Amino acid sequence: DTFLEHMCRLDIDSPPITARNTGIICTIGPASRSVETLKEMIKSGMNVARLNFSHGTHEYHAETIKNVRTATESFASDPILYRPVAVALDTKGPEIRKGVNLPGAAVDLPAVSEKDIQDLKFGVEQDVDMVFASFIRKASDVHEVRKVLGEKGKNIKIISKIENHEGVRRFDEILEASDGIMVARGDLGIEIPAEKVFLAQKMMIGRCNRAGKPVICATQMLESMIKKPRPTRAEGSDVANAVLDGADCIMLSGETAKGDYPLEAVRMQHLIAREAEAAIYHLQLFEELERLAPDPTEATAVGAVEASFKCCSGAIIVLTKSGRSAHQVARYRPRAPIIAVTRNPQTARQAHLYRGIFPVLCKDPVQEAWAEDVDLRVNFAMNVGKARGFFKKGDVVIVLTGWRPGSTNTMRVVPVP
Amino acid sequence: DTFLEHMCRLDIDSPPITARNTGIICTIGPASRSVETLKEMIKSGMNVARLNFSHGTHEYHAETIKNVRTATESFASDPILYRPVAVALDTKGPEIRTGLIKGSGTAEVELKKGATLKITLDNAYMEKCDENILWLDYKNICKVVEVGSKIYVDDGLISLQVKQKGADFLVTEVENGGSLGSKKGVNLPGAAVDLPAVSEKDIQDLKFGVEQDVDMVFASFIRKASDVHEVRKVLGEKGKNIKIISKIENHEGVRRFDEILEASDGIMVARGDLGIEIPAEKVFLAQKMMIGRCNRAGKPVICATQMLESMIKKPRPTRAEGSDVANAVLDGADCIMLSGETAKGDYPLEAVRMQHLIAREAEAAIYHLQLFEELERLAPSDPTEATAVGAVEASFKCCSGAIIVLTKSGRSAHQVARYRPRAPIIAVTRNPQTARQAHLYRGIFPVLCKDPVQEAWAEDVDLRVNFAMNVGKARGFFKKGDVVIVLTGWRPGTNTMRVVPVP
Amino acid sequence: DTFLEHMCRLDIDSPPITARNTGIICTIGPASRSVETLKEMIKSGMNVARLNFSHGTHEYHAETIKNVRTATESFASDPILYRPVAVALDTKGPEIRTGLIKGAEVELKKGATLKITLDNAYMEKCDENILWLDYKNICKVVEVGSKIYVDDGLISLQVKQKGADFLVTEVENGGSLGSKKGVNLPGAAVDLPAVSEKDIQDLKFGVEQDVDMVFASFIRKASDVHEVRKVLGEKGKNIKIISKIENHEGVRRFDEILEASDGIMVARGDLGIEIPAEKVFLAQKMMIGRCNRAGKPVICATQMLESMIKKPRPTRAEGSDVANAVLDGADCIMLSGETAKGDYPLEAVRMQHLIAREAEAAIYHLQLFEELERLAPDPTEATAVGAVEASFKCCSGAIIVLTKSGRSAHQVARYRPRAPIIAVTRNPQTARQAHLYRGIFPVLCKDPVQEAWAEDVDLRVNFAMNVGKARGFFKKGDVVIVLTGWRPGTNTMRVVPVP
Amino acid sequence: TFLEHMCRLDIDSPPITARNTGIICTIGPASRSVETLKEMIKSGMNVARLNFSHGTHEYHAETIKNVRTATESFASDPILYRPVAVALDTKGPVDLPAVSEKDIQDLKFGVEQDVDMVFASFIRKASDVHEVRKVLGEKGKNIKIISKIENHEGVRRFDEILEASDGIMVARGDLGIEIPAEKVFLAQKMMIGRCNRAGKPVICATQMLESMIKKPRPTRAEGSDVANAVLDGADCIMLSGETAKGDYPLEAVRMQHLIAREAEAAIYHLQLFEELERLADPTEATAVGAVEASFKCCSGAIIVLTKSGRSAHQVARYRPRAPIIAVTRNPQTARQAHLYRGIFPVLCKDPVQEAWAEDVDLRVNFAMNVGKARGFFKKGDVVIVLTGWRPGSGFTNTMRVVPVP
Ligand SMILES: [Mg+2]
Ligand SMILES: [Mg+2]
Ligand SMILES: [Mg+2]
């Protein structure tokens, strides 16, 4: 019941028993564009595929997206094991040119270049799940991106990338305007002194956890795996540290984009993230997040997480349409996996942005009686959890639903049949 | 209020408003051996000077120690600003070593990736090593190694892979190349080796350390408790006050950590050496485990290797290195050790100054109250222990500027440090060795009182206390109107706690 | 944040803000027997009517029950305002008493020597020297040095000599002695039958009269409780058995009694004769504590507002004594003679309501729940804990529980929530029996069962929503907790706004 | 937990801990004799109250003289000697004057008789206290003033009365006349609570063991009522007619001792201290630390070397479970220390030593012997010791953990 005990009980000779709760985002490039490679990367644990729009034509990116969706849908014949895979568009953004950085300067470059405008509407056409907005420095930058996406792209998640000092200084207003945050350590390291970057990372991650908004750590993760089949201990420690800081997702770059071991990189990411999970002290996170929260859905979400610790439940099953209800549960960081059951394929993909959310896509048609339709979706989650090893028959799980059709404030404690 | 809020309130624009609490240990070599440089390293924050006895003669090391003390005592005229500097002897160890590179002896050769290298056991080559043939001192290597086995030379800098085996030789391929010097360390991962706790050379080195009055010993390649006991026995009665710090370098050392920790005065975590047998996805877990158990036991723990290595060639470190050092401090490390960055680098002073910056920056992320509260209910009738607890407890209540401890052996200041107060611990002592060894503990700011002993014990106490407050004011620990805690014994020749206001 | 802040905030110049949570039990006798009086007592806050079977015939008590039910059902036309009223049967129990004085009062002397005989030739010839009683086994449970109290401890004797079937005692404290007076044997392990033949008849009377609960007198051990259980048999197996602890053996063997009982009654008066005065308060706090821990109802009875038999207002000592019983954690307070035969029956009920309601302000609810949760050894009990936890954090006006046997509401009450528990049921018996638990506000639903389950749930929920707003537990805009099952024939918790 | 503490209560188990609440006895015709006073002292009387509603100054002077003859008859053994305080209770007089003419005569007689405390009747506001304070003047500036709360206005303006007073007496019998019965218990709990938080002594009086005037045993209702007063947090309990005029004054004291001792087992100390701590200077910091350390080490006692008694009062506020042995050379503070719960005042009559260190250990060792004799602790046990640092130090800012020799 102390964080000190938790560290003292760490045993490197025992395999990690809990699942890997942090999302994996892989940059797709020449080394990982093929359908066959993408299939194995999905099998190895890739949750999100990022397309870097600093280079490449729209025709080139359209094919990459096509390949990602081909590899993803090849597993669709088994809905119990089917893993949703999101598509992320990463803008080139404003540049100064050999690129130039102006440390501490309030750069007045427009939030969205002419190329970014083209790429953003291309992202709307391609039905991407989220956008990584480069070089975000203020709230008006985020809303300018939102404006370009327009009405047709209103459901596309906007992740603001913090790449300089102004972004760190004005972090609160940026966070309040964004759907999530990406911490670009590499770029941050050239804008502020290196001995202050780790402080910035912990601050931003902390405020994202407090706000219940997804935070992504990017750059300088496993870069040595571009040439090597194994990473250094320092890289394994840095990655783990980002997980323990409270990051929702971790992003790979050249390791999966152009490297010689893209598949080994994804697997090494999965291993490190799963190993770091044993050092995570869940009970303290939840109790602190509770005391820092400012509604029947909020109250039910807290109750579900609270009960998940009391019952030692194998999972928290959440029936959701937009994903919002599952997100509210994720904010409180339960140790138990959050099985988000949805019929919306987009919300299933976007759910990977939140730590601990294991999204499943229900393809069964809507049943006439509401009580029937709820039981159907729950039993679907029951089957997935059994197949994934989350829980077994006889265990207890928490289920969050709505009370009436299109009403979620209902919690029930049910045994696994 | 909460750990999460403490993180949220972190501010890279706000200047550091706290003292740097973690000790800085610098390896002394050709680039930092001079008196002029040593003075500047002390002013920059060096607390302990490590002497690596893997190379160099006793004569060479004696001059280094002399130069350290010359630079140290040049500040001794002002007792208020004087900072004690400890001397550490790092043993060569019982690890397998290569032979002499042919020629003068040193003499280095270039091993290139993909090339063939023949490892021999024929003593005709024990002083004739090069890129083609390599001699090592483990005669039984062919029986303990296999085809496909990997061999690491010079602390993991160079890696080889065995291709085929002979009666008295091995044919290998150079996997990770580099420059090879004479008598370098050889590591055989996953191999069963017969190695003594301490070598014949280590024995004469430990004796040399006693005659040179060193403060601590870094014992290399400790795998079990009996390894520490041997080092203890060699030091014997004459060196019974010399602290023994066990270096954990392999899997067995981690596996048998508890018995080693119990037998040792402290622990060094050699991450780079750990990474030889232990994969990248597990090393960080071993670090947090060993540091945690060291904190729980109240014994010093040092993080070593792979810290600011890029500063050997550059004046600035990478952000990854900054995060790595910081995470070590946040894990709960008492000290951070620099190796080649101060030993042979081009910027030994920038290395010390940067280490000071990073350690001071990381101090803002430390959540003190949770540490003490957990270390309280995790702690194993002793009047000194209860007084120590009470002093730390009161330091949080009164928001004390410091906890002043009057000590002779350091023991009293150590028991306070285990509970990790937010306020600095000013350990006032008349024992010079106590003042130097105190750097091993986080949060302890040792102070050497040179004033003679007053017969009136109450006058002697208030004299030492007034000295501590002058030190505290000068270092900016506290000012007039602040309150401090004072720990003393009750009679002349430690169960007394006093809450006193600063005038 | 602290219990002492709670005590410091206490304001006597401030009206009681919360609803009365403890049950009020009133002994119905000559002064409260009429329908007119009963109606007023019900409106004044009476939850349970106790019938003391020490006095009165079956037909006398049967008429009292009839009047209680006539009074109770006169409010049945308004289902929202209707209050269930339970009926309690209190057995006479076994008892050791003397005999007739030849002639009939005498005068005892302090320090003198009164002889105890068992010869029936003096069963009607008792006086200053010789005296007889009916416990023929008294010379096995009493020994040299034992104490013998006579007539409510008004006369104390100390055993000096043992005999074949006689005792020689010295009058420790004098007084005056009548005939057929009660005898107590402090410390002794009495072997009287668990249930006398009269109690057997009265228990069978309770079954055929459909009483809700029985207060079993003079319970010393687990087998005593099961003997009462046997008499009630199959027909009365749903009747709650509340064991009355009245002597030292009952206190010593309290655990086995509680483990065999549905509830406990603390009889302070009888306790005061059996054990020293400086220990009764400890026993009361102990027994109430273990009952709170076990989640079983506990009733404090005797010596409550006794002065109100002759006066319209109680003393400050009585007001303090009742309040402290409530603050100890008692579920119900029982009124005796001041409602049964006194001159101010409905004043005593109203005053009991006032005292209990004022005592609620000194209760530190959040402390009690956190301790009860942590000291606990099932989907329903996980949902019950979750409901109480949510009620504190939502600052809920109430916890609405759908139950048919009462069980689900009972295990919510165990964790002592601040918010009142509105137990909605169609079973009239569980509605009456629910008064035994602190904070449970039972309502009886008379609406027909809807074939669509989700519609029947909302019907009962809406009924509770109307009751709570009428009682002032909550208003529109507030948030309440709702506990239901998920299918027809309690593991579902819902957070819902008050419409 | 507090709940499990209640569950563990065993009436068959003898009270092991010492009695911590002071006992104040009203002295009258039934208890005036020296030999009866001797027995009351041995039975646990800490304070003798003189009711100046009746009797002449010559009558009360004889009573005070008898109280001191009985007290000093035990003086030949400083180890077992128990200090006994003398209390003057004014007759008293809503715009009636604070001090009547008779009261003024009685208050100045009290100064002349060197009483330790005064129970001021019918206090309704802070100005009433200031008037009593002014009467006692410079000569009686060290005499503790205990304001008696007897009416509704006194309860209303309680905060300002508490601030001006040295202590509070809850006159429950008189309270019951002016305010409804379903509110008196709330007022008592409120006043006791605020007194505990402020760290000032609170006394519950009237309607205690009244039935013991004519009977040797109290009713269970009285036993329960007295016990709950203790459990509310009262520092002292006061007997009236039971000791003043009753047939069993000695039995009344012994019963009050038993009840208070039995109620001690129901007290949940760690909750009190933790709440008192979170609802709060070198000494005040040392006081908290000593109480906290006493719980950790399971200390047999907290030894406090004090001159004015204030240091012991600071420790007493935080309600430690361990007995507070207050070692003083001042006979007055030794008698006044009984007003505070958990303080066991002891009077050192050893000559002052030249070396201040020697004089400290002398007094500490005195407490060691007193503790062993009283059964608070034994050889091998550990106690907390609070002292000043040097001669002249008013601050008890020095805490030491020391094994019992
Ligand atoms: Mg960029
Ligand atoms: Mg090595
Ligand atoms: Mg009876």
Residue numbers in the entry:
A (entry chain C): 24 to 120, 207 to 403, 407 to 519, 522 to 531
B (entry chain B): 24 to 403, 406 to 518, 522 to 531
C (entry chain A): 24 to 126, 130 to 403, 407 to 518, 522 to 531
D (entry chain D): 25 to 117, 216 to 402, 407 to 531
The paper states:
Pyruvate kinase isoform M2 (PKM2) converts phosphoenolpyruvate (PEP) to pyruvate and plays an important role in cancer metabolism. In contrast, PKM2 has low basal activity and is activated by an effector molecule fructose 1,6-bisphosphate (FBP). PKM2 exists in a dynamic population of monomer, dimer and tetramer and its pyruvate kinase activity relies on the formation of the tetramer. Upon formation of the tetramer, PKM2 can adopt the inactive T-state or active R-state conformation.
The mutation R399E of PKM2 (PKM2R399E) was shown to disrupt the tetramer formation on one of dimer interfaces, thereby producing dimers and decreasing its pyruvate kinase activity. PKM2R399E also adopts the T-state conformation. No significant difference existed between the structures of PKM2R399E and PKM2Phe. Residue R399 of α14 on monomer C forms hydrogen bonds with residues E396 of α14 and E418 of α15 on monomer D on the C-C′ interface of the PKM2WT structure. However, residue R399E on monomer C may not form the same hydrogen bonds in PKM2R399E even in the R-state (in the presence of PEP or FBP) because the three negatively charged residues may repel one another. The existence of R399E in PKM2 will inhibit the formation of the R-state conformation induced by FBP or PEP, and lead to a decrease of enzymatic activity (compared to PKM2WT). Consistently, in the presence of FBP, PKM2R399E is less active and has less of a tendency to form a tetramer compared to PKM2WT. Compared to PKM2WT, PKM2R399E showed a decrease in activity in the absence or presence of FBP, with a kcat/Km of 0.6 or 1.8, respectively. PKM2R399E tends to inhibit the formation of R-state tetramer (R399E on monomer A repels E396 on monomer A and E418 on monomer B on the C-C′ interface) and leads to a decrease of activity even in the presence of FBP. In addition, association of tyrosine phosphorylated peptide, acetylation of residue K433 or the mutation of R399E of PKM2 promotes its protein kinase activity and nuclear localization, which are correlated with predominant dimer formation.
